[PDB]
């Protein structure tokens, strides 16, 4: 039924590393469009939505839709056995009990084969309509990660507040109060860009531990996109080339 070949094993390894600390057991839904995933954390505060498009594989074939229930800790144990540049192949049948992983290296002739037993997972998926966000901020992923760690050392919550001039991240705690302000910065640079598309100013509060967990996707892209509007959760999006990895975070209200 299912045979999906990645040219770089790195993509899957990084993707799994970016999810496992948020949601441990996930269903990989495989269809003609590719391999998708949606899962809420145990507290139902955050939601991860991944799409690996069939275009991103050197050979994607799926005769029948299949939900592969996988414990991501076991998957990381197995994926550690593949170097970033290994040719990776997933295979599965019609009523599978396991997923077949094959790692092949160049100039070596060594082949690694693993059969990970699947598990039954009842995952509640949510319908997320396409939204027109009040503010869209494109910024270096490493910078966002550094800011999140720094403020998480000092507070449980962060206010993300976007105006036309720039974006302010602020926090309050026992040690005191802090803030980091970024201004819209366009240098040829490369990944230093910082752009704000804003129809209306917006200020929302969020849990810093969840954002720090989100930032474990930093290795997937030099750029991160934050999408905010007053009445819906924050969207933190990392582009994959092949599709995307999105995190949704419900806000804190009534501080």
């Amino acid at each position: 039924m299912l045979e999906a070949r990645l040219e770089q094993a790195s993509l899957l390894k990084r993707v799994v590393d970016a999810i496992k600390d948020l949601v441990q057991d996930c269903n990989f839904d495989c269809n003609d469009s590719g391999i998708a995933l949606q899962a809420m954390d145990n507290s139902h505060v955050a939601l991860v939505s991944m799409l690996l498009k069939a275009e991103g594989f050197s050979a994607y074939r799926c005769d029948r839709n299949i939900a592969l229930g996988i414990n991501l800790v076991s998957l990381t144990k197995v994926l550690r056995a593949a170097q970033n540049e290994d040719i990776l192949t997933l295979k599965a049948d019609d009523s599978p009990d396991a997923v077949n992983l094959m790692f092949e290296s160049a100039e070596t002739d060594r082949i690694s084969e693993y059969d990970i037993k699947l598990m039954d997972i009842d995952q509640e998926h949510l319908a997320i309509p396409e939204t027109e966000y009040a503010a869209t901020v494109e910024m270096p992923s490493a910078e966002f990660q550094r800011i999140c760690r720094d403020l998480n050392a000092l507070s449980e919550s962060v206010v993300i507040e976007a105006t036309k001039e720039g974006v302010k991240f602020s926090c309050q705690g026992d040690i005191g109060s802090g803030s980091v302000t970024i201004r819209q910065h366009t240098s040829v640079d490369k990944p230093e860009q910082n752009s704000i598309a804003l129809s209306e100013p917006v200020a929302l509060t969020f849990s810093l531990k969840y954002l720090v967990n989100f930032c474990k996707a930093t290795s997937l892209s030099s750029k991160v996109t934050l999408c905010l509007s007053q009445e819906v959760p924050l969207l933190v999006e990392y582009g994959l080339g092949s599709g995307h990895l999105r995190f949704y975070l419900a806000p804190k209200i009534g501080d």
């Binding site: 809420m40 139902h44 505060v45 955050a46 939601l47 509640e124 998926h125 949510l126 319908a127 997320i128 849990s207 009445e231 819906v232 959760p233 949704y248 419900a250 806000p251 804190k252 209200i253 009534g254 501080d255």
Partner: peptide, 13 residues
Amino acid sequence: RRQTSMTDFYHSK
């Protein structure tokens, strides 16, 4: 004061 839930905004599908 209240951490909202993802299910407050998006309904099950």
